[PDB]
Amino acid sequence: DRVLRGSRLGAVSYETDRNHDLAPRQIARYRTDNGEEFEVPFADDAEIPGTWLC
Amino acid sequence: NSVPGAPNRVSFAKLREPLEVPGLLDVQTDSFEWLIGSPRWRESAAERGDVNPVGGLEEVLYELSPIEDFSGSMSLSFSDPRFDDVKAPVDECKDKDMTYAAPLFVTAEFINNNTGEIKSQTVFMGDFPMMTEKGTFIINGTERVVVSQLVRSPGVYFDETIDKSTDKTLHSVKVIPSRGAWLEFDVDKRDTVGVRIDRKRRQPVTVLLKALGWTSEQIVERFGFSEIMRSTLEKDNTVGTDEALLDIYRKLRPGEPPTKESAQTLLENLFFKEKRYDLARVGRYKVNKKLGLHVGEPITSSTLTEEDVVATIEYLVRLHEGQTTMTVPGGVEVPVETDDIDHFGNRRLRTVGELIQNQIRVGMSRMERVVRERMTTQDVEAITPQTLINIRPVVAAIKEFFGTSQLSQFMDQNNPLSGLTHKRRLSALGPGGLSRERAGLEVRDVHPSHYGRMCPIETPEGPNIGLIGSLSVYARVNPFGFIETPYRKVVDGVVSDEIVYLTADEEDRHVVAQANSPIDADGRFVEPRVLVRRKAGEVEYVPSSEVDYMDVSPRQMVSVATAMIPFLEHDDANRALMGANMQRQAVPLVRSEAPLVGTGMELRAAIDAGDVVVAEESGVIEEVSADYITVMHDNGTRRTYRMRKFARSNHGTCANQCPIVDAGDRVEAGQVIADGPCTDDGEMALGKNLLVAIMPWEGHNYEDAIILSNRLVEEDVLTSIHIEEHEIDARDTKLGAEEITRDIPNISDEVLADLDERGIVRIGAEVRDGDILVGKVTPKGETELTPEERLLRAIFGEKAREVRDTSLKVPHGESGKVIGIRVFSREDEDELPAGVNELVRVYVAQKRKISDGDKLAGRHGNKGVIGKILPVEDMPFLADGTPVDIILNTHGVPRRMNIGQILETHLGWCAHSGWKVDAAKGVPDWAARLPDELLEAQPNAIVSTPVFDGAQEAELQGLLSCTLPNRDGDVLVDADGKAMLFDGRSGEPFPYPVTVGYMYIMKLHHLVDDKIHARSTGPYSMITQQPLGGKAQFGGQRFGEMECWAMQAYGAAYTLQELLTIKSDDTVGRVKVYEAIVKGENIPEPGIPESFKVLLKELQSLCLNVEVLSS
Amino acid sequence: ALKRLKVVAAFQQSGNSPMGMVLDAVPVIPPELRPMVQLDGGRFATSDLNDLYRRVINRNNRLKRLIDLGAPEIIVNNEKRMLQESVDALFDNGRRGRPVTGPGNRPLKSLSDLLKGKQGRFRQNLLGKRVDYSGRSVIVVGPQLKLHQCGLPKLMALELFKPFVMKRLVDLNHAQNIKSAKRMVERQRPQVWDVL
Amino acid sequence: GAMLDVNFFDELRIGLATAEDIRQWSYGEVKKPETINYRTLKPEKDGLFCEKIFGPTRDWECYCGKYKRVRFKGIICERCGVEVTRAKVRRERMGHIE
Amino acid sequence: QAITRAMADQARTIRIPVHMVEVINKLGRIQRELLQDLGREPTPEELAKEMDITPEKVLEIQQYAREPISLDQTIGDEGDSQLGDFIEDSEAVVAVDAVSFTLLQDQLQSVLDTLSEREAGVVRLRFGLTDGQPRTLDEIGQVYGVTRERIRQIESKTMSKLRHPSRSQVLRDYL
Ligand SMILES: [Zn+2]
Question: Which residues of C touch B702 (CB under 8 A)?
Fold first, then answer.
């Protein structure tokens, strides 16, 4: 009925996919009130928040 | 005759026509003016039944009015619909993309009951889309045609069934209303009578009788003759009307606590109260005609009756007992017989007036619901009709009928015949009719009551055989919707001239003669036995005194399109179907030559199609140009008819009109004054006359292929004009406004040659597939740039160019001149939609010559693509020097049973070269019944053979034997119709004579330029990553299950793997195979297709733990 | 007992448990398989699963509110029945009762309707796909050809063999790179037939 | 069994999913019936389209805008919450409703 | 209050807040009452002067008041096809821009490698062609042991050398 052209609300970037030199990260460890523990990788120049939504 | 500006077309007919053909658009125009209430319909119904002249709008307003609230404190009434004038004329509405309507005014009236007040006002009820002079609506600039619809009429339908095991005859009744609740009856394998009401289980009918209020004494008194009824009264196991009423309440309504008054009034409110049950006036008339309850009374109070229910049960039990007639107490007797639901006295025609009236009624119900809602909330003494009435659901109902429905279709205009036969069409499928998948093979057949009410030939040959028909030539439509047909009344063996219109029931009652039977010059028959048509569709031999009706003419059964095939009665029915379907796919050429042998139904089908300018009053032509004719009338005034010059049709052809009068002529009223697309001097002309040979030639015409000549490309014989259009629109997006200007981002200068100072192309500039039509550039903003493009921009100094180019480019394969640019704008106060600031349409027209791949056809269903266009020197030429123009194969004639083309070829040669029958020693005995002035004819004499009364084989043999020589003494075609062709390529004559003659072939709209597409890499889909489909896109081909089975049967595994992975779904694989092909490397191995991972995500989302293992 | 022993032996022989027939956590299909796509001009298009998920989430939040508020049994039981009907209509629409309709009174397309019939995944996309490098035309008779030959029109053959002709007319130095070669092919300059 | 879907297959086993499998597949709990903000067209927080649960919309470009390169990869934006990776992980990550 | 508030909060797919739902309903009632009296559809100017706002604001409200269509209706009336299979993915990999980008990177690597080592390292660190991280002028000067004015002079000379047509033609065709 038509030739309709639609796009989702985002843009695709295309750089190289390298995995040898990345920005450094350090892993925090949050524990809920369930007795279950989760690990999230933040950045080095980043303040660790006290409560994280797991 | 009877049309004043006519070409003299001599006829072979031997019968006198008592009745002329009716107006061919009276199926549409009379129905719509019935819906309006026009004074022409008023005087017609005045002279044919003036006891109740009511239009569709007055009927809807009376059956709605008056609306009352719950307490009965006040009431609202409508009356007197009235239309204003049309706000814009037809060509202006077609050009400005606005609908063609007229305002509607209704005199409302609000009455206070207890206090006593009347507040009469005048309410505007929206704009009503009116119908033009040719039966077409105009909706948003396009031209739409609402086709008719065959539905099964409401009534009572007795039918019988035979048991498989016991082999007893089981009878059954269904009474089916409109919008009501069904109720049935039965006689089972035992002696019980079911009453299965509103699709419920079963009860004995004596339960329903007691719930209606009949005692067992009353049941044995009324049904005293019926062993079945007294047996079921013995087996009813239920006494007490209240007990039986509670029983049917419990069987009908499950889960509700039964009260006495609600259980009592449930059945009454379900059936005998007009709000929830109304078989229409047609249904009430049908019930009264079947049972015999009333005869002289006019139809009113169209709800059911307990008398009707007990008469239905009486009819059923007498049909099961085995009676043949039955008298209802209080009415005349009727015969007792089962009903056929495919009889044409049981299928009514719900035409355009009734369809639009149904949509108005649906809108008025939703309006009156909110009227009786808001009547009670806001107080009394403050309300007025203009605050009570909300016309939004009514106007939305009309708009949602005219758009987005499957009965309001796009008008199919390639030519006048297609435009005419898109109306006069009875589509049996639609809302309220049967679907396509669930339609049985019983309803798709030709019932023997279609004789004169439908065409047995013309149906679509696809998966719609029998579900779409077309009206016959002489047929009409009843006030109710039954399809009448005219018959001559013969009184005591003398055929009179008075014409009686009989529907299918009366045609079954009487006995009808045949049209080509020997009248004895006053009305008497000649032979003492007459072939007739009896009641059940049987054909007998009845003596000439029981005959009491006769047909008006032969070709009463055929349609409009089937009436233009010469020698129809020699073709087979499948090939006649293909001919009648391909006659309305022809394209308008640039020259439009009239056929050398036709039938009589060409002038009338042209001046009634509407694409021919017809003079309204007589006068003398004052000035002719290519744009207008101004006739000077007999009393002072003058009238200038404009012309449509090179206007695009719906399907992309051309709609040129050119005058055929001189600047001093005298015209009469009704005379053709200007041709159309496919007409020539008044009459229809869909093709050209081409000299044919019926030999097989070197394999180029093998299995329906055709070889032309180059003369038809040199002299522009089969050349048409096609016009496209392209549309872009500049709206205001979020980041700014789009701009139509020639300042495009990064592009060469040379592609901006033909563009003007402000965007759009100049008129006359030739375009090509890839060129710029409208230069539009959208704002982009600031995004992330790659370092490589950043370095290139810093090298060459250009800026970021913050606006993105999305122009309008002409798509692939198109070319041709630019005809006109139609540009709308916001600043000129044009009614663009929300957001659009400027819309511009560009028309590109090209002139297509004939080429191999284009599809040609004749009239008798012999189509075929063009295989090779030879040069004009290597064609088989006659002994005189004339080359032939097409060469048709001879293996497709005998096994397809269409020798209408051979007889048309012979008569075409006779009508081309002329004849003179030597009446020196009297008229010879083949021509004893030829008319006068068919004994001689000049060359290029147009003749006409009508459909079932045409030129006989003996007359064709005689006319073939006596023609007249070309220029010298040379008769090129001997008595058999065959000529001694030479061979233009090797030189020697062909060893045996070959049939030649003139055949009328036409060019079909299945052209090779519109069908070819290809794709290497284009757009891809959204959810799954497969390519798109269709020539409107780039579009890929579909490689389905059967092709997968063929590849597996071959054993090609790698071909199948690369067809299903790196060509459809391997998203990381398509770019790798493209770069490997471009760099010249080897093709990589495929990966997992995308659709399988989509499948795994759906299966995991249905709470199933699908996990793929490893080893 | 045989017809019961079928499913009882099925639950007994494996390491399955029958407790998976009731649910405590519906899963949610990822948002690229039920997309919200903006058309040309601000019209949106959703995929009818967002309505079913929205009804489940709305009724579950309302039920959490009613339970933590404290409500009578009639209200809470009606809410639980509504939540159950919503999840049933999500997994299979039109199985128990009336189908949930959208606008214009058409039934919505639930999760199980992506899988069944001729329009499902298994028959519409897994077994028969659209393909690249393909095209159609209308056939005519070629009675001078040999048995292993077919005539191909040049306008279709150019579009089918476009990457091969781009590689070859870069390698023969008719163009400098892939972009200019593609521009030359789409404008159909007359070297491309001698390459083709 | 592995789920990276590289072409080393031997089986395809279907079972009956338990709740401790569902809340081990999922990447976070969707708990609002919101899809997209009506004015700015960005996916709402904890909705049906939330980038914190289903991954980011723009390739290697987080939501609030603090990290925008391929240099930052697999890091969690401590203000907004989205991890920075490709945008094709929005067809591969599921959520759950409690 | 609870029924109308929750109908505003839940009746729509893209959620519109309560105050904008209020002004949409007010605009609808105003437009209906004006359409009844006029006998015509009211213009945005008449609606704007009625509601005491601007016609741009009226257009924005009528823009926000639109409901999405569905991807699952069969836009082919034969039922064979649905609307979701007629939409071009306008943000996909175009399969010739990727190979063109790869060839551009190859050619840029070649032209950068046909220079002096210090100038090539300066250009790579200046435009971030090493690892996608552009470096600062003082950072390049620190890691190469010279001053920032020397670094920017070397950069200007190298940019002139690359801008010269002898090295620049094979990249000039790409843009
Ligand atoms: Zn962030």
Answer: 141, 143
